[PDB]
Design a protein around this ligand. Structure first.
Ligand SMILES: *[C@@H]1O[C@H](CO)[C@@H](O[C@@H]2O[C@H](CO)[C@@H](O[C@@H]3O[C@H](CO)[C@@H](O)[C@H](O)[C@@H]3O)[C@H](O)[C@H]2NC(C)=O)[C@H](O)[C@H]1NC(C)=O
Ligand SMILES: *[C@@H]1O[C@H](CO)[C@@H](O[C@@H]2O[C@H](CO)[C@@H](O[C@@H]3O[C@H](CO)[C@@H](O)[C@H](O)[C@@H]3O)[C@H](O)[C@H]2NC(C)=O)[C@H](O)[C@H]1NC(C)=O
Ligand SMILES: *[C@@H]1O[C@H](CO)[C@@H](O[C@@H]2O[C@H](CO)[C@@H](O)[C@H](O)[C@H]2NC(C)=O)[C@H](O)[C@H]1NC(C)=O
Ligand SMILES: *[C@@H]1O[C@H](CO)[C@@H](O[C@@H]2O[C@H](CO)[C@@H](O)[C@H](O)[C@H]2NC(C)=O)[C@H](O)[C@H]1NC(C)=O
Ligand SMILES: *[C@@H]1O[C@H](CO)[C@@H](O[C@@H]2O[C@H](CO)[C@@H](O)[C@H](O)[C@H]2NC(C)=O)[C@H](O)[C@H]1NC(C)=O
Ligand SMILES: *[C@@H]1O[C@H](CO)[C@@H](O[C@@H]2O[C@H](CO)[C@@H](O)[C@H](O)[C@H]2NC(C)=O)[C@H](O)[C@H]1NC(C)=O
Ligand SMILES: *[C@@H]1O[C@H](CO)[C@@H](O)[C@H](O)[C@H]1NC(C)=O
Lengths: 133, 175, 48, 49, 35
């Protein structure tokens, strides 16, 4: 009822590892399940930091975790390496960077920031051209 | 399938696990709580059960069980939960707590903003646990009952042969 | 040659994990596996 | 398998209240679990829509 | 690389959200630079 007709969540109940699905088969006075499951392969390790403070305010990942390969920080998922640029659409703010321990320094690059800059530069060039007329 | 071992360092973000990790001072690598559990439960009748009754020893000995327990403890406090689903990763404890809170339904900041208070509360709770076991005597009934039942069954079976069963005499030779 | 021996059980390898307070580990690849499992469901009927 | 190697969503299964983690300990012919659970404290009432 | 992908326009609501002001601003710039 649980493994077949739906995706279960109780760990180590419908097969070792994260559960994808199952298939039933009959047998004389018994049943045999084939659990199709998922398992992470080789891994790499990095340096982490729970929070980020940019404008004197803490930043927390929306859904992910902050990793770094030595020079540039990134936010990724918890089960597959795929970094992205730190963006406000990936972080939410709370408090100010004085009470948490282990916080580090970086820059937070809102994507709506260059989205609006795409017309801020338009306004700037419009006014620069308009200075004379 | 891997007997993980505790690291030499013992600074877990302010939390205090000293009461559960194994103690090297004792010849047996038990822990304080396990020591109290072993002392509270009391197990020459065993020598008098020679009349055909034996008590075979368990395959796993207490040290081996303690080693399993130590492996589980060293896994769950350094690798998080992933060591039960493949390759064992490594996560700092102070943020695995944040992941657990996120799982509950509250966000992350609520932990980091009260890290020290939560650590103190957990330390006080784990300290207070010991007194509950040490004071009362009814805490460990659910395991005392099993050994009491086995002892009662063995005693009844042994004493049964003294019954004459309506025969001439209980002793065999006099018949 | 061949002979019967007795010894003490092995609990597996050790694989110590180097815990640190700024170290994280992320997999970069995965795998998909299939695990079999067997369960009895009904013993044979009978009558006397 | 559930309350130790992971966080369980089954209410009132791994401790009275919301569940965080667990710790096992051995005992003669038995096991002892320490469930670390979370419980809300004093509250306040408000008006909702 | 994705299979079965189809063709259509993705309409970011930020586009009309900006546009409601940006086209008005463009008309104002026409009324601004000309005189
Ligand atoms: C850690 O990861 C970051 C992110 O990839 C690495 O920094 C980036 O490295 C790439 C190349 O690996 C740089 O790309 C550059 O592209 C220009 C053309 O636009 C080319 O002329 C350069 O020669 C270079 O290939 C990129 O600029 C650089 N920075 C960023 C922000 O992406 C970094 O190297 C990694 N470090 C380690 C130790 O792995
Ligand atoms: C992250 O960056 C912030 C700012 O970019 C750093 O705060 C800065 O800390 C330094 C040294 O702690 C301050 O310099 C000195 O501050 C004292 C006051 O305590 C002042 O009297 C001195 O003349 C000198 O300026 C600096 O002022 C302060 N920045 C600001 C805006 O106040 C912070 O330390 C960085 N943290 C990490 C982990 O990188
Ligand atoms: C972890 O907790 C243990 C026990 O709760 C601490 O051990 C005691 O620490 C107090 C400190 O006030 C001493 O007075 C006792 O003598 C200690 N008892 C024993 C048996 O060691 C331990 O110091 C704590 N360690 C950390 C790092 O928190
Ligand atoms: C990333 O993990 C690897 C192992 O998977 C680390 O490399 C070894 O880690 C063991 C762990 O105890 C050490 O005993 C060895 O000395 C390490 N060898 C080397 C060559 O480093 C590696 O250190 C980890 N990455 C970082 C940044 O620590
Ligand atoms: C992830 O692992 C898979 C296999 O586990 C990799 O696929 C193999 O790639 C090599 C080199 O390209 C081939 O020789 C093998 O035939 C591939 N396997 C199969 C089953 O076809 C894959 O490349 C890995 N991913 C990354 C990013 O390294
Ligand atoms: C989706 O639209 C793109 C955009 O036109 C199509 O790409 C064109 O494909 C034709 C035929 O291969 C080429 O001649 C054009 O040069 C392509 N243009 C561009 C801009 O790529 C694409 O074929 C369309 N696909 C579907 C399934 O409709
Ligand atoms: C990790 O713990 C050691 C031991 O106290 C400490 O020196 C170090 O600063 C800690 N790392 C971080 C990132 O706080």
């Amino acid at each position: 009822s649980e493994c077949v007709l739906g995706q279960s969540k109780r760990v180590d109940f419908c097969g070792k590892g994260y559960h994808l699905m199952s298939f039933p088969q009959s047998a004389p006075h018994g049943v045999v399940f084939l659990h199709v499951t998922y398992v992470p392969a080789q891994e790499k390790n990095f340096t982490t930091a729970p929070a980020i403070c940019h404008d004197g305010k803490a930043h927390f990942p929306r859904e992910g975790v902050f990793v770094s390969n030595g020079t540039h920080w990134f936010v990724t998922q918890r089960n597959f390496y795929e970094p992205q640029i730190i963006t406000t659409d990936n972080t939410f703010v709370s408090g100010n960077c004085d009470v948490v321990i282990g916080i580090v320094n970086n820059t937070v690059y809102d994507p709506l920031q260059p989205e609006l800059d795409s017309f801020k530069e338009e306004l700037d060039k419009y006014f620069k051209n308009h200075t004379s007329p | 399938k891997q007997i993980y071992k505790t690291p030499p360092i013992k600074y877990f973000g302010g939390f205090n696990f000293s009461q559960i990790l194994p103690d090297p001072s004792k010849p047996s690598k038990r822990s304080f709580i396990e020591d109290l559990l072993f002392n509270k439960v009391t197990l020459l009748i065993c020598a008098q059960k020679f009349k055909g009754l034996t008590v075979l020893p368990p395959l796993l000995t207490d040290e081996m069980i303690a080693q399993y327990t130590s492996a589980l403890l060293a896994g769950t406090i350094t690798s998080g939960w992933t060591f039960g689903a493949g390759a064992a990763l490594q996560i700092p404890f102070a943020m695995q707590m944040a992941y657990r809170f996120n799982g509950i339904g509250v966000t992350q900041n609520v932990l980091y903003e009260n890290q020290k208070l939560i650590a103190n509360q957990f330390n006080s709770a784990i300290g207070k646990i010991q007194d509950s076991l040490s004071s009362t005597a009814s805490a460990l009934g659910k395991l005392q009952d099993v050994v009491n039942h086995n002892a009662q069954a063995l005693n009844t079976l042994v004493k049964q042969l003294s019954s004459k069963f309506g025969a001439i005499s209980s002793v065999l030779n006099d018949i | 040659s061949q002979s019967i021996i007795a010894y003490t059980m092995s609990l597996g390898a050790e694989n110590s994990v180097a815990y640190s307070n700024n170290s994280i580990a992320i997999p970069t690849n995965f795998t998909i596996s299939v695990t079999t499992e067997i369960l009895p469901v009904s013993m044979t009927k009978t009558s006397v």
